Symmetry: C4
């Protein structure tokens, strides 16, 4: 309505060639893993995965390889994985096939999505144990209002594609899904937006848990939550919100910063 | 016994001091983790010469890397950047400009989105005088008891400014904390202290049923520890600690 | 093919050098997590591969953050005397570890560190529920030691703990803290790391409300999938590597092969 | 009881000269402040104070000066303060006179005590709001069992009242305020402070999570005797001192 004008926010970049787009994505992919490591989302052993669709090779995805610590990962460590077979088509190492099954099915169900993020975190795990939608407790939780789901089954590791299919079906067109008794998944039209939604979702889980422990807080009414969610929950806002996180992660590691593509 | 805020002979010297302190305060807040909030956080500092214009951190610049040269000067009425190229967060700026207009005594307004501040703000409740450290807020802060989404209309900023009255802080319910100060330093101390007090209150409420300090004691304590002089002085080691962490920024310190 | 396998060594000397290096790095990993703040309380023992009933240990009072392979001491199981090195072990903690080692010839390493979440959860004298997938490795595979008699200054109290542990991967010493074991140091250190985080999650969820646990039959299946030695060993690898990357100086002490 | 023999633990050092003793104490004092800064106990503005009695000059105390951040302090920044007047007798800067009044009265009441520590912390502040003794919830809390008090009022006369309530104990909880510990050495005092804050953290979390069971008094008292002596506190602090040194090579070089 009285939202800022067209030129207020920065726009996601567009690239001439697939190779230029790919170099940009692999760098942002590595930086996002460094950002998540610094938040402590790298402690979960082999559980964490970020997939980014290759712009040129349909139905193949860049991924962090099994067991590589997020804190040291570089673009050259990323592997490209075939969606259907989960086989590595570029690189030597394998992906986490269970996590990858979930991601590939989400990617297949969501052609609009460039990136899927699933990391095992403390606040995310704890909140997921309630099998409950994230309430619109504060303005910052409103981007998820009427735009996330709870996957209300838990059948162990997703070793059958059918489990991935069921998760993707429950996600529908939403930005996030809570795997009950498991943890958070976010998606985005860009890696940047996906990584912002993940960061924000974990912080919202933290806030909700603490407020519930401390007393009986009041949530924002639906009508205001929905308005606020429209204001703050768009791809453009998510992409823009991620930028200082990317930049801050660069400033922290001069070595990674030097690998930024021309 | 206490140090006094400095006096300057020229606007240029005063301005350079303010911009340096402004950037260091952002580095202090980044180190506390208050830089995780995307585009939400804002600190405004009145320019000492140019009435009704305010230095601000620009939209999307990470607090951890910001320098004086990154700060933008923004016109209070239009929210237009009049010095620098980048834009301010116009929603947050609407709140700050209205508070500045309502409070000629205030040099600085701070609003950052934090975990403890967000959580506590969800209760729409004044911060109790639970410990000595919470007493600076006792009978000196308000709750803004409305939430209508982003503050995109100056009128909503006006309402917040009206509710703040002469107080040092206001809790925007279901949103987060705002503090003010006669100096940037005092404002940044109040913000730091308020977040810690929110943390302590939430933990104590979760753990059981704690007892507050009685109002009579709280008010006396609050007078002792809630003055501008105390707030300004309390901030000094925080400024210095932030400097020690970045030698590069430390070299940009004016004389 | 998919998972890596623990290494096999041709000589006791090569095995030993590998273990001491991994032992030091594990202590660096735990320091970084803040599990080094407990004064003298924390202990990791690693069985020597050649010398029966003797154990490498971190020495009393050496900070985890600076420890190197050369600082580790080898301790006799029965006497708790240092047989290699100069310094003494924490004899109370060692009594527990020696008895567990004696009871569990399959175990290479025993880990006991005093942590905030571990201590807090241990105050409830309660098994760790299968609240999330990550807690399932402990499902039907850990015990609670349901006595607390002070420092373990008698072998007999170590015996009681070892008896209650049975064949499990972990035991919660009530009003005290966590102990994990493993067929390798790596797996033991992964179980400890994971156990502490699971204690954290359980405490927060119980504080926040009334969460629902995974049903037993699903928990048991998940626990078999994620609770094997192979999975534990593999899960630890990025933690070892991340600790190395943090200290180039320690990283240079890595043995070859 | 079944406790280790004579030579098992290291002993606090003895010096032949006050000059050597003093240089040792000032170095340890600076390092302890670095240790506490790293724990985040430096966030509390002007609130935090560590006093260390000078070994030679009666009723005078080394202190961190008002408003110097803990993270950067060196031995040369410490000031020596007269107990009675709170005047700086060595150095230029002033101490926090309010906090110092509490410390000086504690020192006066406790000739056995070398060091008094009062820092404002999150878990300490929160737990102190309950005006309740720290229960023997885990082994680690047992050093405080029957060896700490709650000051059941609101903050020289105030210092006197605190010192009276502390009696011969290692710690006192200032209700609705925060923690104080003391020690026969700086090292032991700093260990008790570190440990006390962690114990407050554990107690708060366990009380939030449900209804935990404490160690019975008889076992708590035995455990407290095993782990709550000066010797054990001194020894427990040593890795914390050494770890703090390893973190700052620059401070490490100032070691006497
Ligand atoms: C067995 C396998 C293919 C992968 C291992 C693995 C997967 C996951 C997960 O997807 O949640 C979590 C932890 C973990 O270790
Ligand atoms: C639409 C717009 C002007 C600004 C962005 C923006 C503002 C705020 C806020 O003021 O609370 C929080 C997050 C955020 O992204
Ligand atoms: C008296 C003695 C042998 C050892 C010291 C000692 C042991 C323990 C323990 O095992 O839990 C914890 C702390 C500590 O200081
Ligand atoms: C007025 C004065 C001498 C000191 C100020 C001061 C005292 C205290 C305290 O004693 O608890 C805490 C914070 C603080 O800022
Ligand atoms: Fe998973
Ligand atoms: Fe805001
Ligand atoms: Fe122990
Ligand atoms: Fe105080």
């Amino acid at each position: 309505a009285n939202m800022p004008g067209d030129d207020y926010f920065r726009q996601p970049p567009v690239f001439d060639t697939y190779a230029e787009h790919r170099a940009y994505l692999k760098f942002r992919h590595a930086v996002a893993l460094r950002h998540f490591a610094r938040l402590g989302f790298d402690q979960d052993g082999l559980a964490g995965l970020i997939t980014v669709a290759d712009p040129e090779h349909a139905d193949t995805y860049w991924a962090n390889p099994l067991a590589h610590p997020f804190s040291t990962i570089t673009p050259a460590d990323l592997i490209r994985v075939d969606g259907d077979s989960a086989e590595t088509v570029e690189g030597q190492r394998r992906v986490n096939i269970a996590a990858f099954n979930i991601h590939a099915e989400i990617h297949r169900a969501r052609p609009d999505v460039q990136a899927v993020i699933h990391l095992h975190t403390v606040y995310g795990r704890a909140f997921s144990a309630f099998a409950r939608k994230l309430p619109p407790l504060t303005q910052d939780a409103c981007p998820f209002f009427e735009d996330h789901e709870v996957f209300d089954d838990f059948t162990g590791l997703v070793l059958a594609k059918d489990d991935g299919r069921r998760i993707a079906k429950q996600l529908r067109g939403h930005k996030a899904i809570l795997l009950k008794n498991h943890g958070l998944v976010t998606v985005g039209e860009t890696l940047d937006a996906a990584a912002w939604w993940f960061t924000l979702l974990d912080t919202c889980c933290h806030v909700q848990l603490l407020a519930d422990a401390a007393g009986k807080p009041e949530e924002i009414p639906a009508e205001v939550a929905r308005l606020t969610g429209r204001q703050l929950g768009s791809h453009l806002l998510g992409w823009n919100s991620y930028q200082p996180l990317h930049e801050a992660a660069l400033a922290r590691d001069p070595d990674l910063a030097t690998m930024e593509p021309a």
